[PDB]
Structure formats: C-alpha cells, structure tokens
Amino acid sequence: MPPKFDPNEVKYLYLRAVGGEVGASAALAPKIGPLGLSPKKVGEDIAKATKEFKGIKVTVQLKIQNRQAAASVVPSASSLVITALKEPPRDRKKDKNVKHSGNIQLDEIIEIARQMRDKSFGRTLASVTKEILGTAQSVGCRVDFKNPHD
Amino acid sequence: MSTESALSYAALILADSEIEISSEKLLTLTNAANVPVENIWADIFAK
Amino acid sequence: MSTESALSYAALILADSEIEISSEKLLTLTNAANVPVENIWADIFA
Amino acid sequence: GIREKKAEYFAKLREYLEEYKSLFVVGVDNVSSQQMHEVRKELRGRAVVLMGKNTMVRRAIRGFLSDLPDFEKLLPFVKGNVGFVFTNEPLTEIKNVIVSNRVAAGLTVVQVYDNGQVFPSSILDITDEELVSHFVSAVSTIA
RNA sequence: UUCAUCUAGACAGCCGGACGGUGGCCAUGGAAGUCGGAAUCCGCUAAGGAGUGUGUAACAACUCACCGGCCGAAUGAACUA
Ligand SMILES: [Mg+2]
Ligand SMILES: [Mg+2]
Ligand SMILES: [Mg+2]
Ligand SMILES: [Mg+2]
Ligand SMILES: [Mg+2]
Ligand SMILES: [Mg+2]
C-alpha cells in the first residue's frame, strides 16, 4: 500500500497527465482512461485529484465550486464548435446557490450560508443568479437559509 | 512559596475554597499576594 | 484546628500572633470564636 | 474619511473590552495570513480575536481609562507585534487552542487578562502538582 | 505664502505578513494573477488586486499594490520675492 496526491483540473472526455504521472509508473493513456470513469456529469471543466498506491487508478474527482456552479446552468451540446465560442448565462438556481454552498464541504470559512452563499453567488461570473437578477450588492439583501442552514 | 503561603493558610482555614473566600482574607491580613496569585487558587486546586 | 492557621499564619506576615491579629480575624470573616480558644491556642503554643 | 474608519475601530474595540470579561495578549511574529484565518475557524465558537496597530490601542485603552480602568496596566504589554484574544471560556482550554494548533516551521500567548489581573500564562500552566502538594506538604506542617 | 498629511504615529529607512472561494469565464497544443477578449464578486480581514512587475511550455519561485513592526516629528503639492 502506497500514498500520494496529484491534482489536474479541467475535464473533457478523458485525456496525457504529463511527467508528474510519469516518473511514478502509472501510464499515459491509461491514467487518462481511468479518468473517464470520473469525468462522467459533467462535460465542461472539473477538478480531479488522482490518488497513487503503487499502481492504483483512483480518479476521485473532488468537487469544484465553480463547477457545481457552472453545471447548475442548462445543458446544450458538449464539444466541437458552437457557431461562435459557447455561452451559458441564464440559470435561476435561486435556492440552489446556497444548496451549492451547502455542498461546500466545511470550506466557506465564515458565517454559514450567510457568507458562504453570498460568495458562491459571487463565484457565478458566468450565469445569471436567482431567476432574473445579477449580483454585486443584491447579495447583501438576502434573506434565506442561514438560520435554517447554520 | 508566594502563591502557596496564604493559599495554604486557606488550605488549612475557613472551609471550602471560593474566589470570594480568600479575597476577604489576603485583603485582610494586611499582606495580600498579587490578586492574580489568588485567583489562580480558584483553578489549579479545584475540588 | 481553626486558630492553628490564624495564630501560626499571622506569625509570618508581621502580626501579633495573639488575639488582636488572630481572634479579630474570625471577626473579620464572620466566624464565632471564643475568648478562651485562641487563649487555648496561646497556651498550647508554649 | 480616515477619521471615519479609525473611529469605527475604537467602536468595536471598546465593545469587546466590555462584553468579554477576559483577554489574551498573543504575538503573531511571522504567522501567515493563512495561519490566522484558521485560528478563527478553530475559535469561532466562543472566543473572538481582534488585531490592529499599536498606536491605535495605547490610545483607545487610555481613551476610556475613565470607566473600565484596570485595562490601564495592559499598556506595558501592548508593544511589539501583539494581538488580542477576548473570551468567556475557562483558562487552560483556550490557551492551548492558541499556543498549539496550526503551528508550522504558530502564535504565542504572552499575557492574560481577567478582571484587573495580569497572568503571565506561566502561572496558568498549572498541573495541580505544586498546588496539591501545598494542600498536603503543609498538612505535614500540621500533622 | 497657501493647501493637503501627520503624536488616533504621517513621511522616509530597515524588517514581517502579502489569504480563502479559485487553476474565477470565454478562449487553446498548452494560458492556473502576469501572450489574450469581458467583467473587478464575495469571503475573511489589521491587510491581500479575480492582479504591479521578474519569470514557466503550462503550475512553481520571487515581487508588488494593501496591512503591520521598529523609530519619533515632521511630510506633500502649488506659489511669492
Ligand atoms: Mg503564484
Ligand atoms: Mg503566464
Ligand atoms: Mg476586504
Ligand atoms: Mg507636528
Ligand atoms: Mg516657477
Ligand atoms: Mg504671496
């Protein structure tokens, strides 16, 4: 039984983990192939952390906050070309911005969903927040979860 | 010792050992410890 | 004893180890002593 | 503008000197932005710690030497790189949350406040050894 | 001379910290603060830019803005003759 910790973000289909995987005798396309069992939900940027025990294919893809955020948008397509350069800015997720910060395993470092979910809403530099809205100082005027969350 | 002279004169007088106890003694024997050398006795020898 | 820590304790803090700096001590702590107990502590001292 | 924010500091400072009945003087020489941010999470429950400039505290202390007076002789301790930890917990338990945890190669407790008292956090590190053998080694001086 | 900063500690000098969401989003061989398009949000804070520069293939590493330790009383700009 051996131990380590290497992490490489982004996630398309399942592709070389460079030299860090190399001088360890994992494999090139095989470490990338056991990284398909992970990269499956979602299909646009993740945060995988592969564990190393002698030769163990442990692709435990830990939760990226901007990813539980981006994934909370719609869907549409998966790769190739998007008539321009892709876009995703609409999703409501009114009470899903905090149900995402609730999934922020401890983390947050603040006053529960009051400050964790006022920052996760901020992490949304791509979507459109609670139904029809934006961000900025519309977060300081939030009344939900919090007392229920904490 | 400094914080074990009147505290021992408290560990052999009165009854129990409260914070409001020794403070009516060291501040009565015309020679107290350091007030903090007294409140310590309400901590390191509890019960 | 009770006057054993008031007549032997006031003898290290410059105080007349008798009844003015030992018996009044009980008085300055609301404790019922005796006019012949500290004297019984004064005699047992010898 | 800048009288603005400073005065706001006198505010939340004066408020801790009243509410919390106890205080630690900790020293954060070196100590990362990351170290501190994680002594918060560890003491989030009871204690709360507050930081700032020296010359803002020597004044604010004296700024209310009227009421709350025995914070006066806290001043010959608020030099160098110091910090404040206000609490309403027992002694021992708090200090070791600070003195120990999140140390790498941590911050140090140099003085403690409890109702006009000045603990060196060295007469706080008691183990009922010189305190139990003083309720007994004098009992052999009584028997 | 005037205006502004400054004993609630300036200016300068040396010295410490320079964090979490988070490799933020498009974009691509690869771009994680730093070839590059658009935003500049929060947390925590005494303080820390979704980033001044050095640098990597891309991370690292360093630096800085911002805060502090030390000191102890002056500093900044526009003018007058
Ligand atoms: Mg960096
Ligand atoms: Mg670069
Ligand atoms: Mg801030
Ligand atoms: Mg002056
Ligand atoms: Mg000219
Ligand atoms: Mg003129």
Short mmCIF file of C-alpha atoms in Angstrom, two decimals, chain B residues 2-4 7 13-16 18-19 21 23 26 28 31 34 38-39 42 46:
data_model
loop_
_atom_site.label_atom_id
_atom_site.label_comp_id
_atom_site.label_asym_id
_atom_site.label_seq_id
_atom_site.Cartn_x
_atom_site.Cartn_y
_atom_site.Cartn_z
CA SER B 2 4.38 33.20 47.19
CA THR B 3 1.18 31.69 45.76
CA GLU B 4 1.30 28.85 48.30
CA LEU B 7 -3.33 29.71 49.88
CA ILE B 13 -8.56 27.56 57.38
CA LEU B 14 -12.16 28.62 56.71
CA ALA B 15 -13.97 25.78 54.95
CA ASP B 16 -14.05 25.31 51.18
CA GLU B 18 -14.09 30.03 46.68
CA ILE B 19 -12.89 33.10 44.82
CA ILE B 21 -13.33 33.45 50.07
CA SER B 23 -10.14 37.60 48.88
CA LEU B 26 -5.42 38.13 51.89
CA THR B 28 -7.44 41.43 55.38
CA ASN B 31 -0.39 41.35 53.26
CA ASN B 34 -0.90 39.69 43.88
CA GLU B 38 -5.02 34.43 44.44
CA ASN B 39 -7.47 33.83 41.57
CA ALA B 42 -9.62 29.13 42.28
CA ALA B 46 -10.41 22.81 42.33
#
